[PDB]
Design a protein around this motif. Sequence first.
Motif, short mmCIF file in Angstrom:
data_model
loop_
_atom_site.label_atom_id
_atom_site.label_comp_id
_atom_site.label_asym_id
_atom_site.label_seq_id
_atom_site.Cartn_x
_atom_site.Cartn_y
_atom_site.Cartn_z
N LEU A 55 0.80 -1.22 0.00
CA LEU A 55 0.00 0.00 0.00
C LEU A 55 0.84 1.27 0.00
CD1 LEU A 55 -2.87 -1.21 2.33
CD2 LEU A 55 -2.90 -1.07 -0.20
N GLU A 56 2.03 1.22 0.61
CA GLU A 56 2.99 2.32 0.59
C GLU A 56 3.53 2.54 -0.83
OE1 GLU A 56 5.88 1.12 3.55
OE2 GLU A 56 4.95 2.33 5.12
N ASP A 57 3.86 1.45 -1.52
CA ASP A 57 4.38 1.48 -2.89
C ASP A 57 3.31 1.85 -3.91
OD1 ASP A 57 6.82 0.74 -1.71
OD2 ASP A 57 6.75 -1.34 -2.41
N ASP A 58 2.02 1.60 -3.59
CA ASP A 58 0.90 1.89 -4.47
C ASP A 58 0.54 3.37 -4.42
OD1 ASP A 58 -1.59 1.97 -5.93
OD2 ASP A 58 -2.11 -0.08 -5.29
N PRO A 59 0.67 4.13 -5.54
CA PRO A 59 0.36 5.58 -5.50
C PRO A 59 -1.09 5.94 -5.23
CG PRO A 59 0.86 4.94 -7.72
CD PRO A 59 1.19 3.75 -6.86
N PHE A 61 -2.79 5.05 -2.68
CA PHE A 61 -2.99 5.11 -1.22
C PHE A 61 -2.14 6.14 -0.49
CE2 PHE A 61 -6.02 1.69 -1.30
CZ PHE A 61 -5.67 0.94 -2.41
N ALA A 63 0.13 6.77 1.92
CA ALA A 63 1.27 6.16 2.63
C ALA A 63 2.35 5.95 1.61
CB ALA A 63 0.89 4.82 3.24
N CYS A 65 4.60 6.24 -1.33
CA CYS A 65 4.27 6.89 -2.60
C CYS A 65 2.74 7.09 -2.68
CB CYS A 65 4.78 6.07 -3.78
SG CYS A 65 4.38 6.80 -5.37
N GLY A 66 2.31 8.34 -2.75
CA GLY A 66 0.89 8.68 -2.77
C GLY A 66 0.48 9.42 -1.50
NA NA Z 1 0.74 4.50 -1.36
#
Ligand code: NA
Lengths: 298, 295
Positions: A55-59, A61, A63, A65-66
């Motif tokens: 979820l951190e890596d997913d833009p 969301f 957290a 990236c994003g």
């Molecule tokens: Na994210």
Amino acid sequence: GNPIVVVHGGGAGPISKDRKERVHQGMVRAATVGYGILREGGSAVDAVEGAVVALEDDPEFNAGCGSVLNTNGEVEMDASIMDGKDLSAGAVSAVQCIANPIKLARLVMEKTPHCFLTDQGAAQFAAAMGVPEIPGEKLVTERNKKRLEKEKHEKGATVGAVALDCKGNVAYATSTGGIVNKMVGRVGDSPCLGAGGYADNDIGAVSTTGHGESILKVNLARLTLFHIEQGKTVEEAADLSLGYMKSRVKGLGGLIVVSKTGDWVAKWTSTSMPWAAAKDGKLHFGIDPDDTTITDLP
Amino acid sequence: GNPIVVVHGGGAGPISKDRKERVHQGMVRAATVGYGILREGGSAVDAVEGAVVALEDDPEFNAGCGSVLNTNGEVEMDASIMDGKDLSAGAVSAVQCIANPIKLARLVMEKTPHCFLTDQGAAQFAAAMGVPEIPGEKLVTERNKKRLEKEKHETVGAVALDCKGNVAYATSTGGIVNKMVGRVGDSPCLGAGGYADNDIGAVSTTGHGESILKVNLARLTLFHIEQGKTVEEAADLSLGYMKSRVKGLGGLIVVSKTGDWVAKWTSTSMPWAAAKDGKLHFGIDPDDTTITDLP
Ligand code: NA
Ligand code: NA
């Protein structure tokens, strides 16, 4: 022994038909990683970390990236992780230029005699641990630049996971970019144990989202677990805790819970809260109230 | 209503005959300021802040001037304050070069839409609020320099119930000796460093910060009170749980909404003082309590 993973996004609503599908796929992916770790005999801590890294890596969301931007258009992140067996924990606040605050929170837990590092010292610890520095610019999204401008002009006038592993251990992980247009150095509920989440093998695990100040004031995650201790179901506990936050401090938000007995729920007082749960080879998903999809997980 | 103020120092080891008297005078002074604010009709928030400012300025105590040193021989401070009426709060972590972290925590509560600021952002906010910058050396004591060297080769607070029935807590610290740069303890974390709620009471803690954070010590104490336990039973149960579950020692002070108060600790000692009904209560070691009158 039946492992469970529950994941949440940030209370987001309303969203475009096409972004709703990217959010859905993001939630499915996070729960798939989490459940996959649990199914291979991995710990509840590894599962919640794996789900949150996704979820951190997913833009899509709030957290990693994003992450929403502070008043200076910068990404300042907070994260915490807790182990229900021994109550061991790790947390970071006002972290910048790192891809994964939850991995840094895990590092605080495993590599230091502490459980909370902030800003400069957290940055120094990340460097000493060989955590790569990324251009703070690589965490900023155009959607978040627009959100900031919208917020600043109107003023003219928060992801996570909980898990129960095969061995009966519970854990939570919470990670955030905070609130749009926040002050420099503002710390939310996310890195604070009892507020951002709480994990105890003798009760269960909670991960929260919403208005951080409100979550901190009511100690939302520990409060939820207090109602469970008193004999309430996971649903009653979540309703009572969220309800109290709404009435007492005028705060809205959401949470995910897993009890030591395997009962779980996702509840929110905000418009929406993307969430997903995996248990007994089934995937549960939703964003809006009383709209849930269940699919089989091989 | 009858206002009450309870204050505490940091759990201390066996101290020198003359150091005990400076400690005693410091505790009396903090409780005197706190009680004096309450007696003039001041709020519980003003009282706990006044008492804690006294302890921050006093070099004898681990807060403000007299704060323990980090691994780099620097003073990094944490503080939190909470008002039990609306649950409004203010907190600061890893603050440097300011005399009174508790005053900065009060400013976060009153002047911002937030309740927790850290390091660089807290320093920027302090400057924008006109908080004077003091040299780091002014917070450093020789006793602390020795403590750091000793450690390398091997915390204060107040609770109050005002005349209007409001409860508050304030907690301020220098942290733990030889801590990592940017280490945040329990002191600025609501529910751990303290908790205040007019519907239950107020708690301020001290001890091993990591342990206090893991058990949510201050909110835990108040859960036991909610369940019908006395202030003494609640303190014993919460401290006892911290000791058994996470191997942590410490102390706390409690004031219930009904006016019951207590000071309890699992560490060697904990300087404490309480003022209620024109009387001052004081102690450091278990069952060494002295009571004096005050007009
Ligand atoms: Na994210
Ligand atoms: Na002091």
